[PDB]
Write a protein that binds this ligand. Structure first.
Ligand SMILES: Nc1ncnc2c1ncn2[C@@H]1O[C@H](COP(=O)(O)OP(=O)(O)O)[C@@H](O)[C@H]1O
Ligand SMILES: CC(C)n1c(=O)cc(N[C@@H](C)c2ccccc2)[nH]c1=O
Ligand SMILES: [Mg+2]
Lengths: 100, 144, 145, 50, 50
């Protein structure tokens, strides 16, 4: 809770819980989704990068290329949490990665 | 002679031997009149035909023909290499770049010639809807 | 005499006369001439400029040519067997083939970084239709310098 | 929180012996010399012990 | 879908069930689907009169 609350208190919304991410919703539009923040995740592995959904998208693209296996990213929560926007961000991830 | 491809030399020989209409071995005003009337059109009635002799008065042989064209040929190169060079110059290799890219680069990268001649040719067509430099047409308009 | 030859080759390399020489181009003339030293060492002999310093401020080639010669004498150039030792790690099935996506990933991300655009140019015209490159041909392509 | 427990207590990553032996043999090429015969399991045991 | 070279290749949208009941009935404090009001609340009269 307090890892979340001190992060979100500083509008650091993303944290990992081991292998994956937990996101507590900012109703404010934070800059954590700027398309130039996506590039900072390019190849930046989970132990190096600060937690974000873009880290999970990069991890799925890395396990894809290494294991030669299909991957998935399973956005979940209550209503109003950001699943549609996080989906739009994951899709934005792959869109801008292919865009450069 | 080392500057010339033997193809152009033989073409100059073919042109010189066909142009001597009276088997003269030399060129005169009357030969120019028949050449312009047969090759061109009746509009060649202007006095300018007399000015053409002023450029090279008196008989001239194939050797002086070759030397005069060779000095006049400064900046000219065989078409086959120019076709290859244009195909290499295009990034797509197929004549589809816009004029503004090529005129900016040519003026920037070397030899700041006057912009107006390249601009008049490349802007002779709108670069936004017809900017494709189909280099075969460019090289042929220069020559063929 | 060889330094004078390198100087005229650099004058023919330079992109425009307005470039008295940018450190970006200093690295590019290093890489394009018959040398390819690791950047941290040459930046060390220059004096380790900051990234904004290296981008904004200018350099003079005159002093660059002696250090160019010195690093050429250091000869941090690899070797064909060393390259095969390096690239063979990717030959996971041991048949002489490596996957181009793996090469772009490590060559862009892991060492001296290159954007996806220049690594694409790096593989443009030689990448296989299935996507598996044969390392002996790739090392030979590198050997073409 | 269970996903934290299982990620800390468990083993988040596993690699096939052939894929990793070939991939990271680079850590100690004397443990996995080329040309010479090496078992992936036994080689992996030596490398990791090294 | 990604190709072998890792570049974006294709995508596939599968949708499971639209809340069709909403089209004709909404409780207090909730809208019908946004397409309805955004065509009614309109900057473009042509959509409103067509
Ligand atoms: N991380 C976030 N940043 C900015 N706005 C958010 C975030 N998460 C949720 N919201 C806002 O909350 C509302 C719901 O977001 P949405 O992605 O549609 O989730 P859901 O589909 O569960 O309603 C939207 O108005 C959205 O702008
Ligand atoms: C079985 C599963 C949990 N798993 C692993 O346990 C390890 C995976 N991949 C390894 C090979 C890897 C490590 C680092 C970067 C890319 C890939 N993939 C996986 O899918
Ligand atoms: Mg005559």
């Amino acid at each position: 809770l307090y890892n979340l609350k001190d992060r979100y208190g500083s509008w650091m919304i993303y944290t990992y819980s081991g292998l994956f991410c937990v996101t507590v919703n900012p109703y404010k539009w934070l800059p954590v989704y700027t398309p130039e923040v996506v590039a900072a995740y390019r190849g930046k592995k989970r132990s190096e990068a600060p937690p974000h959904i873009f880290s999970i998208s990069d991890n799925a693209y890395q396990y894809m290329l290494t294991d030669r296996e299909n991957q998935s990213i399973l956005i979940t929560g209550e209503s109003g949490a950001g699943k549609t926007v996080n989906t739009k961000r994951v899709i934005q991830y792959f869109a801008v990665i292919a865009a450069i | 002679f080392s500057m010339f491809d033997q193809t152009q030399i033989q073409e100059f020989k073919e042109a010189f031997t066909v142009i001597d209409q009276n088997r003269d071995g030399i060129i005169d005003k009357e030969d120019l009149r028949d050449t312009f009337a047969a090759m061109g059109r009746l509009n060649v009635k202007n006095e300018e035909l007399d000015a053409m002799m002023k450029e090279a008065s008196g008989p001239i042989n194939f050797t002086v023909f070759l030397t005069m064209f060779g000095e006049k040929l400064k900046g000219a190169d065989p078409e086959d290499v120019i076709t290859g060079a244009f195909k290499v110059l295009d990034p797509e290799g197929k004549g589809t770049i816009k004029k503004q890219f090529l005129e900016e680069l040519l003026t920037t990268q070397c030899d700041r010639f006057s912009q107006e001649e390249i601009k008049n040719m490349w802007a002779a067509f709108p670069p936004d809807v017809g900017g494709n430099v189909d280099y075969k047409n460019i090289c042929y308009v220069i020559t063929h | 005499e060889q330094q004078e030859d390198f100087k005229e080759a650099f004058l023919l390399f330079d992109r425009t006369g307005e470039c008295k020489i940018t450190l970006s181009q200093v690295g590019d003339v290093l890489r394009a001439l018959g040398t390819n030293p690791t950047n941290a060492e040459v930046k060390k002999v220059l004096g380790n400029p900051s990234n904004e310093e290296m981008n904004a401020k200018k350099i003079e080639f005159e002093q660059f040519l002696p250090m160019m010669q010195a690093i050429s004498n250091n000869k941090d150039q690899g070797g064909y067997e060393d390259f095969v030792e390096g690239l063979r790690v990717f030959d996971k099935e041991g048949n002489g083939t490596v996957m181009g996506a793996e090469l772009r990933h490590v060559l862009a991300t892991l060492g001296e970084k290159m954007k996806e655009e220049e690594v694409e140019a790096l593989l443009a015209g030689q990448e296989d239709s299935n996507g598996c490159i044969n390392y002996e041909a790739f090392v030979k392509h590198i050997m073409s310098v | 929180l269970e996903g934290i427990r299982i990620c800390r207590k468990g083993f988040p990553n596993r690699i096939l012996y052939g894929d990793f032996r070939q991939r990271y043999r680079i850590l100690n090429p004397a443990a996995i010399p080329e040309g010479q015969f090496i078992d992936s399991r036994k080689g992996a045991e030596k490398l990791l012990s090294s | 879908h990604f190709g072998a070279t890792g570049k974006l290749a294709s995508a596939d949208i599968e949708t499971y069930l639209l809340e069709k009941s909403r089209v004709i009935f909404q409780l207090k404090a909730e809208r019908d689907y946004h397409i309805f009001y955004q065509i009614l609340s309109n900057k473009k009269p042509e959509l409103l009169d067509m």
